Amino acid sequence: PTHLSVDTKFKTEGLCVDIPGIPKDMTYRRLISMMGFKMNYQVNGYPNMFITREEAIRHVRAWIGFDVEGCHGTNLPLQLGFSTGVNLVAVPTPLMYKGLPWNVVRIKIVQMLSDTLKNLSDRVVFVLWAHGFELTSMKYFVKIGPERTCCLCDRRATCFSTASDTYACWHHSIGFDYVYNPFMIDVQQWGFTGNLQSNHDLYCQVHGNAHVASCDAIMTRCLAVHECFVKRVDWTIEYPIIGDELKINAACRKVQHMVVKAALLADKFPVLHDIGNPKAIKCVPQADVEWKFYDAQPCSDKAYKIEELFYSYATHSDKFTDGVCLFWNCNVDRYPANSIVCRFDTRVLSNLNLPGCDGGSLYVNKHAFHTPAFDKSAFVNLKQLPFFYYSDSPCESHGIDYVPLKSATCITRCNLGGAVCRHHANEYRLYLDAYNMMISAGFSLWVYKQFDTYNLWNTFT
Numbered sequence: 001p002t003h004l005s006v007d008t009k010f011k012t013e014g015l016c017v018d019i020p021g022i023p024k025d026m027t028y029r030r031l032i033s034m035m036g037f038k039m040n041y042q043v044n045g046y047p048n049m050f051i052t053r054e055e056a057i058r059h060v061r062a063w064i065g066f067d068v069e070g071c072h073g074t075n076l077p078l079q080l081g082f083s084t085g086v087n088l089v090a091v092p093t094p095l096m097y098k099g100l101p102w103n104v105v106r107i108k109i110v111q112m113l114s115d116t117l118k119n120l121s122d123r124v125v126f127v128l129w130a131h132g133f134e135l136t137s138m139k140y141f142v143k144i145g146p147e148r149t150c151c152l153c154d155r156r157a158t159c160f161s162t163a164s165d166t167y168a169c170w171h172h173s174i175g176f177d178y179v180y181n182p183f184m185i186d187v188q189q190w191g192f193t194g195n196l197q198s199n200h201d202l203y204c205q206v207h208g209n210a211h212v213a214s215c216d217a218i219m220t221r222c223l224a225v226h227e228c229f230v231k232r233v234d235w236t237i238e239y240p241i242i243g244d245e246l247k248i249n250a251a252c253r254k255v256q257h258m259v260v261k262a263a264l265l266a267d268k269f270p271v272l273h274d275i276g277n278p279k280a281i282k283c284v285p286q287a288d289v290e291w292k293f294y295d296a297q298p299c300s301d302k303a304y305k306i307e308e309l310f311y312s313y314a315t316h317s318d319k320f321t322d323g324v325c326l327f328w329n330c331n332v333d334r335y336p337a338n339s340i341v342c343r344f345d346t347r348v349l350s351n352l353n354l355p356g357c358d359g360g361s362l363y364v365n366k367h368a369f370h371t372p373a374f375d376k377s378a379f380v381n382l383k384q385l386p387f388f389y390y391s392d393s394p395c396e397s398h399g400i401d402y403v404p405l406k407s408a409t410c411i412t413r414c415n416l417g418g419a420v421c422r423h424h425a426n427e428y429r430l431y432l433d434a435y436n437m438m439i440s441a442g443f444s445l446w447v448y449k450q451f452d453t454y455n456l457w458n459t460f461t
């Protein structure tokens with residue numbers, strides 16, 4: 001049952017205002033036929049245009065909300081809206097384009113999807129709140145058939161060209177006019193009461209209804225993300241490597257070890273309260289400190305309230321004001337003044353970070369993590385952590401071409417001595433690259449106000 005059976009029933013109540021008289025009893029087989037597509041009984045990788053909620057969740061990077069509003073249905077113009085903010089007007093003769101015939105509109109659709117998706121996914125998933133016109137408009141820009149490969153590479157085909165009779169992936173589709181073998185999901189099939197806006201607005205205040213098709217497309221995709229990644233969570237689903245995932249994750253582990261080790265050396269905290277991932281390991285295994293762990297799964301809806309994290313019911317809590325607290329990707333409303341924090345900035349633009357629900361973002365790196373909206377007021381008791389590199393390892397090369405390093409932030413015995421050694425220069429430069437990688441991916445670092453790297457120099461005596 002990996003794919004959605006074409007013989008599964010499709011509820012048609014949402015379709016009956018654009019398509020009055022539509023049968024209540026309807027399969028995806030008959031719906032696709034009504035839409036003008038012929039599947040011809042084919043076992044060539046495309047069994048159904050529509051997919052299950054589970055298949056959609058695995059292909060969240062391909063999600064594009066899509067809505068169509070009958071501007072005036074063959075005799076009248078249609079407004080095509082996408083979750084990219086684009087509105088196109090197709091004449092039968094928040095970016096708003098003037099009315100144009102389908103032969104030119106379809107070229108723009110292929111260009112927009114290709115630029116949006118080439119670095120995200122091998123396909124497109126149109127996320128719908130289906131009322132009828134969107135389904136009947138698909139024949140004007142979509143072609144279907146057997147699964148194919150690109151004419152210029154090994155990737156699966158996503159576009160077709162009537163000018164050359166060739167197929168292309170999102171990277172090689174310049175000049176292509178048809179979307180080929182797209183997928184789609186109707187959010188209305190999941191069991192909702194009331195219209196799109198009333199359901200969307202229950203969970204999100206960031207997407208207004210500016211009464212255009214793209215606004216509905218944005219709300220539809222937002223509602224879908226809420227249902228699949230906010231109220232329901234699945235960290236076992238794996239997602240392919242599309243960018244700097246491995247380098248980012250490795251940089252995160254390096255930065256965490258560096259920052260925590262320096263905080264412990266600089267302020268000599270007797271206890272560290274590590275709050276977050278129930279599977280966390282000590283990031284500084286050699287530290288003398290009393291290491292205490294507290295379990296909190298990643299919050300996907302609202303940031304944790306610090307009052308609830310330290311609420312111990314009918315028993316006394318641990319002394320959280322003693323020592324230091326470590327919140328490594330544990331999103332809280334207001335960090336305590338004695339903290340070391342790594343907080344993902346949801347506003348960051350990247351191929352790993354997708355738009356989410358209520359200001360939040362869906363960060364997809366190995367697993368999908370819906371993250372609550374970044375809020376500067378969470379850090380009022382802390383300061384931004386400045387870049388620095390610290391090392392107590394011996395000054396010896398072991399085993400690249402050199403230019404001598406001069407830097408006030410290379411905290412080593414050799415720099416204290418007046419001249420940074422080759423080993424520490426190489427490690428400083430590698431660390432700086434890892435640091436820049438993590439920051440540019442969207443992570444932000446915050447620390448208790450008394451943190452001072454000047455206190456690290458006396459660890460070399």
Ligand SMILES: CNC(=O)c1cn(C)c2ccccc12
Pocket residue numbers: 273294308309310311312313315316317318319320
């Ligand atoms: C610093 N945090 C804590 O000590 C606690 C947090 N929760 C939820 C507790 C439950 C029972 C006992 C202690 C705690």
Ligand SMILES: [Zn+2]
Pocket residue numbers: 150151152153154155168169170171172
């Ligand atoms: Zn290609």
Ligand SMILES: [Zn+2]
Pocket residue numbers: 200204205206207218219222223356357358
């Ligand atoms: Zn929304």
Ligand SMILES: [Zn+2]
Pocket residue numbers: 394395396412413414415420421422423424
């Ligand atoms: Zn050195």
